[PDB]
Structure formats: C-alpha cells, structure tokens
Amino acid sequence: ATRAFSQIKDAMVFAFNLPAIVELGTATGFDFELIDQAGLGHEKLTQARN
Amino acid sequence: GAAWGGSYVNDFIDRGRVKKVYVMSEAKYRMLPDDIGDWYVRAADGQMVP
Amino acid sequence: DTAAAIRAELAKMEPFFPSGLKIVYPYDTTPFVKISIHEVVKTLVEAIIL
C-alpha cells in the first residue's frame, strides 16, 4: 500500500500498522519538545526549530 | 469604582503571555477627599455633572 | 522532597534568565529538617563508637 500510494501526487499518503499497545504511541525512537523559554514568540521559535 | 478602585477590563498578550488590562485613575487625582470633586459623570443629555 | 523538587525546578530556569537576574533563598525551613536529622544520625553513629 505504501509503495502503491507513492504514485499519488500532491498528497503524502502512507500506510502503517497500529502499535502493539494502542494506549501508547509508536513507542519507538524519541520525542523531543523544543520550548520557548524567553517569550521569543512563534516566528523566532520556528527559526530555532528549522 | 473604575477611577478609585481599578476595573479589570480584559486580557492582553504580553510577549506571548496573556496578561490583564486595568483602568484606574492616575495616582495624582485619587489621593484626597477633595479629589472626588473633580470627577464628572456624563448625563443622558450630554452635560457633565460632578 | 518538595523543597528538593522546587530546587531542581528552579535549576531549569536559571540558564534562561535575563542578564543579571539572580535567585536568592532568604527564608527556607527545610535545611533545619535535613540538617537536624543529619545531626541525630551523627549522634547515632557517635553513640555506637562510644
């Protein structure tokens, strides 16, 4: 399905399997939250994220 | 109440954080008993009454 | 355990302070609880030695 949907243009269609335990998320990799600790706002925070 | 007590109007955004907005008479004009004499409230006919 | 949590929490904000702003602890009743018990522990160990 993921390979077949790779032919769809202007749409990021991709398929995946549910996690082993749905109560949690993917539970693989890492989750990192970049935070604005000095009120830099949205515009400067996006620059930091990029 | 607004002049001598301070009225919380509504919030405002301060460096990305929501903070209150207050209206309250300047400190010079609400200190003595006689200062009440210079406060005027508009009447329905447009005149200013003390 | 609450004072430790607060002290650990305040360590997550100090890096992002504006130039010059500092944290000072002018009053805190937890050191007495910590130190006094660590004084009785000294007597407990010092009692066994005697």
Swiss-Prot record, chain B:
<comment type="similarity">
    <text>Belongs to the resistance-nodulation-cell division (RND) (TC 2.A.6) family.</text>
</comment>
<comment type="subunit">
    <text>Homotrimer, with large domains that extend into the periplasm, interacts with AcrA and TolC. AcrA may be required to stably link this protein and TolC. Interacts with AcrZ. Part of the AcrA-AcrB-AcrZ-TolC efflux pump.</text>
</comment>
<comment type="function">
    <text>(Microbial infection) Involved in contact-dependent growth inhibition (CDI), acts downstream of BamA, the receptor for CDI. Its role in CDI is independent of the AcrA-AcrB-TolC efflux pump complex.</text>
</comment>
<protein>
    <recommendedName>
        <fullName>Multidrug efflux pump subunit AcrB</fullName>
    </recommendedName>
</protein>
<comment type="function">
    <text>AcrA-AcrB-AcrZ-TolC is a drug efflux protein complex with broad substrate specificity that uses the proton motive force to export substrates.</text>
</comment>
